[PDB]
């Protein structure tokens, strides 16, 4: 597999789940070899038990599922690191991690992603970011996390917060207003 195992920048992107650009000897950043696929994930961020000596393919590329059928059940963005769900669909690993009540059937392999126990309070929210970034039709879809500032009611999709730099590592996120004043 093509991997990065250090933080070194060659004298000659980052993880889809955790956004870290560095790799480790015991936790490499592995790059999907699927055609036109740009997934890169840490072994531990994606549940790769054995990094192959040959090519490595993410689960979506392995499935060769129709590109029309590859969609996260929990957010409106495709691309990124996906696993199959218990309901016969797909979901981002990052969405699974940052929506509190989502689980994995196996935490070593991090799959399938289990949605059966999400309560309806993740599902009746509106993503304020989608409402801001020209995605008004998708803002009320999928599942939102809530700002981790106690009492805040701002809600947002995990991936939308991820793209906005509003997640942090317990897996939580803050609306932009409240994130600005948090000591990083
Ligand atoms: Zn990672
Ligand atoms: Zn792939
Ligand atoms: Zn998602
Ligand atoms: Zn959104
Ligand atoms: Zn907030």
Residue numbers in the entry: 1 to 12, 23 to 179, 189 to 203
What do the study's own words say?
Here, we show that the PZP domain of AF10 (AF10PZP), which is consistently impaired or deleted in leukemogenic AF10 translocations, plays a critical role in blocking malignant transformation. Crystallographic, biochemical and mutagenesis studies reveal that AF10PZP binds to the nucleosome core particle through multivalent contacts with the histone H3 tail and DNA and associates with chromatin in cells, colocalizing with active methylation marks and discriminating against the repressive H3K27me3 mark.
To define the molecular basis for the interaction of AF10PZP with the histone H3 tail, we generated a fusion construct that contains residues 1–12 of H3 covalently linked to the residues 19-208 of AF10 via a short GSGSS linker. The structure revealed a saddle-like globular fold of AF10PZP comprised of five zinc-binding clusters. The Ala1-Thr6 residues of the H3 tail occupied an extended groove of AF10PHD1 with Arg2-Lys4 forming an anti-parallel β strand that paired with the protein’s β1-β2 sheet, whereas Ala7-Gly12 residues of H3 curved away from the protein surface. Characteristic β-sheet interactions were observed between the backbone amides of Arg2 and Lys4 of H3 and Y41 and L39 of AF10PZP. The N-terminal amino group of Ala1 of H3 was engaged through hydrogen bonds with the backbone carbonyl groups of P62, T63, and G64 of the protein. The guanidino group of Arg2 donated hydrogen bonds to the side-chain carboxyl group of D43 and the backbone carbonyl of C42. The side chain amino moiety of Lys4 was restrained through a hydrogen bond with the backbone carbonyl of E31. An overlay of these structures shows that the two regions of the H3 tail occupy different binding sites of AF10PZP.
